[PDB]
Amino acid sequence: NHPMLMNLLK
Amino acid sequence: KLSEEQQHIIAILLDAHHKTYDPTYADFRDFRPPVRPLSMLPHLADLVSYSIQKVIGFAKMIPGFRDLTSDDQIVLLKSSAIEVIMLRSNQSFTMDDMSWDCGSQDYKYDVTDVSKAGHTLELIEPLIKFQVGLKKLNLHEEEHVLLMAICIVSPDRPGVQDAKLVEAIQDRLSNTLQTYIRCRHPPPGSHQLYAKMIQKLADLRSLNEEHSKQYRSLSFQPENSMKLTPLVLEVFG
Ligand SMILES: C=C1/C(=C\C=C2/CCC[C@]3(C)[C@@H]([C@H](C)CC#C[C@@H](O)[C@]45C[C@H]6C[C@H](C[C@H](C6)C4)C5)CC[C@@H]23)C[C@@H](O)C[C@@H]1O
Numbered sequence A: 001n002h003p004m005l006m007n008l009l010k
Numbered sequence B: 001k002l003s004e005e006q007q008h009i010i011a012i013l014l015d016a017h018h019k020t021y022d023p024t025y026a027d028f029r030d031f032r033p034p035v036r037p038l039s040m041l042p043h044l045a046d047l048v049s050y051s052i053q054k055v056i057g058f059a060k061m062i063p064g065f066r067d068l069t070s071d072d073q074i075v076l077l078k079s080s081a082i083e084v085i086m087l088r089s090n091q092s093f094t095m096d097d098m099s100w101d102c103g104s105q106d107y108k109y110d111v112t113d114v115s116k117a118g119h120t121l122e123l124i125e126p127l128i129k130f131q132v133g134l135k136k137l138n139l140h141e142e143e144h145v146l147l148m149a150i151c152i153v154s155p156d157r158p159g160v161q162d163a164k165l166v167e168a169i170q171d172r173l174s175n176t177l178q179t180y181i182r183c184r185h186p187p188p189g190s191h192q193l194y195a196k197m198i199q200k201l202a203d204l205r206s207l208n209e210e211h212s213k214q215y216r217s218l219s220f221q222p223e224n225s226m227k228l229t230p231l232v233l234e235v236f237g
Helices: A003-009 B004-020 B026-030 B041-060 B070-091 B111-115 B121-136 B141-152 B163-184 B193-219 B230-236
Strands: B099-101
Touching (some): A003 B070, B026 B041, B041 B070, B041 B230, B070 B121, B070 B193, B111 B121, B141 B163, B141 B193
């Protein structure tokens, strides 16, 4: 679960 | 011979790098200030957190990388981040005094600053060796960015699902690098340059292990973990 990393990838 | 596609790849990575590495270091003013027990941990955590963001930006521009799933993207960046930072940091590293010099005294980092962030010679010695060995390859910028990309897109990282795809993306980058060396890197510096560059990736895996073990320690101390950033916590665990 990686909301910030996920968000920087989007 | 460099195909048009190989040249396109190189141009993309050069530009991805120019977009994510600001050689003025102006952003460093916004970090918590360097203080010189773990006096440098707040500043160096900010520095690393900032650079994780740049590395993510660079990764996103690697040809083929956005064909990956989100999970695989995450997994590759989670395992590669610290390594790519070490690699990219070679641009500020100076052998004049084995320090990373980011434009002023305050932002000049030596081995003592690195120990003031909680590391010992367990990391610091292979890290300096690595930086000096890398510096001595005198890589063309084209080789430097290709190596960062190769580092990120490695099929044997823990957590990888579609290893065959990561491997196909990495192959195209390796073949580009092998071919660039042959066509554009004169002897004698080309001499086994590919194999030497790959050795540096093996050295990074080793540094990563050292990083993890020390980070695991530093974590079991919530008072120190409290000084990190939310990004660093999410990426390094
Ligand atoms: C980071 C870069 C630059 C320098 C890199 C340096 C010099 C300062 C000290 C660093 C950041 C080293 C780092 C302290 C090693 C490490 C580590 C992690 O385990 C650690 C240690 C602390 C606790 C957490 C968060 C961070 C502080 C990083 C995990 C490696 C690369 C070094 C400056 C410029 O070239 C941009 C480049 O991205």
